[PDB]
Amino acid sequence: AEFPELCSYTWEAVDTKNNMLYKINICGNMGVAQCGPSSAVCMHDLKTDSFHSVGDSLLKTASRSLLEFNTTVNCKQQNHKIQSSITFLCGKTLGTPEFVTATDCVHYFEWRTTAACKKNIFKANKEVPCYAFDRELKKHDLNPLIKTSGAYLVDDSDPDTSLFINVCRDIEVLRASSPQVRVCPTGAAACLVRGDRAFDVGRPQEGLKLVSNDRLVLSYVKEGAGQPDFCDGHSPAVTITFVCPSERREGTIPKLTAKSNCRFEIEWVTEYACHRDYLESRSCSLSSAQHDVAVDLQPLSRDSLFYTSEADEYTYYLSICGGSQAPICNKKDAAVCQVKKADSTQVKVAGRPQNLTLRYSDGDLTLIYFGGEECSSGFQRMSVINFECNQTAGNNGRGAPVFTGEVDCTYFFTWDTKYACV
């Protein structure tokens, strides 16, 4: 199959400027009758409450990073039939098909996903859709929480048991630092370690479900034989409910609210359950109105016109928010530029200024730049600036970025500044 792991589900996308909600299924077997058996992309006009298929699975044209779906229906313009186009970019999670734009004749989408990576190293054993659109077509996206490595420890307050869980995907046990996680059965999404016994009590199956128009639920299942003796004829199950706080607050730890008959119920209060637009901006500022917090990083773009974070093998030049770049990078458009220390000529864009995301969630302020140059795996380089509040920092308050490490073409920095004070 083409990007097989994506074919197991019917993915949703949306156009808010036009109140349209798209149903996407790369393999067409989405079964939405009102859209045709082989519809790969089914558009649902909300106002006229109708279903119009704009892409048929049997009329597919595929390339490395591009999927085109033609139809038989012709557009208003003669010799033109309706179609859908999806650009695939390598990602670190299964991600989501992002609506980019449509025209009378063609509907365009972009999809950063593990499925579209050359080096299949970025694939999880099993990952399910990790987001949901609400009644007002707003996206509640939990992708930022999915760990490509490690897991989270749930607070059960037990002394005899430990419980780890990953989000929308299996915990990567194979190469995990913590030797406590390495004992978990491969493919487990929820891992119960009781008295050095490590049991698998949940694997991802269905996608993220919006339940109360607000809350989100993810259910791991462990049906079948081999049920641990202490479950007493019951099959293990983990049900995580994510709730969006009425007001901003420090991130918390997913809490265990019930654990009888190996039927674990977990509650995770995280602002990642709130609509994306509440947590993010495409500029260097956030407001109380939209974000419930006001931040303006613009002043960090005022001794050269660029910040330079030194590294063992490379030099990172971070011109933030329109700030200008270092002369050694004034040859390419980039926000985070990487130069090889043993080769003043090997330069790499690890973040484009047009691809920026200012996010604030659970107490952490992050500035992300992406769409960087591709790494052999396919992943376009990306840089994440972890902002911390510090009223008293060098540079009349401002500060400077500190390259704190790279992880498979994603570069991490820390930036203590007063402008990061909520």
Ligand X SMILES: O=P(O)(O)OC[C@H]1O[C@H](O)[C@@H](O)[C@@H](O)[C@@H]1O
Ligand Y SMILES: CC(=O)N[C@@H]1[C@@H](O)[C@H](O)[C@@H](CO)O[C@H]1O
Pattern 2-31, a copy of itself, x by CB under 8 A? ------------------------------
Percent helix / strand / coil, the chain, rounded to 5: 10, 45, 45
Q: Is 373 in the site for a copy of itself (CB under 8 A)?
A: yes
- Dihedral angle of Cα 416, 417, 419, 422, to the nearest 10 degrees: 50
Task: At 374, list the tokens.
Answer: 């591709």
Q: Is 330 in the site for a copy of itself (CB under 8 A)?
A: no
Among 277, 310, 343, 408, binds a copy of itself (CB under 8 A): 343
Q: Is 333 in the site for a copy of itself (CB under 8 A)?
A: no
Pattern 41-70, ligand Y, x by CB under 6 A? ------------------x-x--------x
Helix, strand counts (H, E) of the chain = 2, 33
CB-based closest residue to ligand X = 376
Contact 365, 395 (CB under 8 A): no
Pattern 93-132, ligand Y, x by CB under 6 A? -----------------x----------------------
Among 81, 118, 263, 275, binds a copy of itself (CB under 8 A): 118
* CB proximity list for 35: less than 8 A, separation 6 or greater: 23, 42, 51, 52, 53
Q: Is 92 in the site for ligand X (CB under 6 A)?
A: no
Contact 406, 415 (CB under 8 A): no
User: By three-state DSSP, how is residue 24 classified?
Assistant: strand
User: By three-state DSSP, how is residue 383 classified?
Assistant: strand
DSSP state of 332: S
Note the Cα 299 to chain centre separation in Å: 28
Task: At 272, list the tokens.
Answer: 């990642």
User: Which residues partner with 204 through β-bridges?
Assistant: 220
Q: Name which of ligand X, ligand Y, a copy of itself, none residue 338 binds, using a CB cut-off of 5 to 8 Å depending on partner kind.
A: ligand X
Among 120, 157, 376, 396, binds ligand X (CB under 6 A): 376
Q: Is the dihedral of CA 177, 182, 184, 187 positive or negative?
A: positive
Among 112, 348, 352, 359, binds ligand X (CB under 6 A): 348
Q: Name which of a copy of itself, ligand X, ligand Y, none residue 5 binds, using a CB cut-off of 5 to 8 Å depending on partner kind.
A: none
Pattern 341-380, ligand Y, x by CB under 6 A? -----------x-xx---------------x---------
Q: Is 374 in the site for a copy of itself (CB under 8 A)?
A: yes
Q: Name which of a copy of itself, ligand X, ligand Y, none residue 406 binds, using a CB cut-off of 5 to 8 Å depending on partner kind.
A: ligand X
Listed residue (128, 71, 83, 76) closest to 109, CA to CA: 83
Positions in the binding site for ligand Y (CB under 6 A)? 59, 61, 70, 83, 110, 352, 354-355, 371
Q: Which residues bind ligand X (CB under 6 A)?
A: 338, 348, 375-376, 406, 409
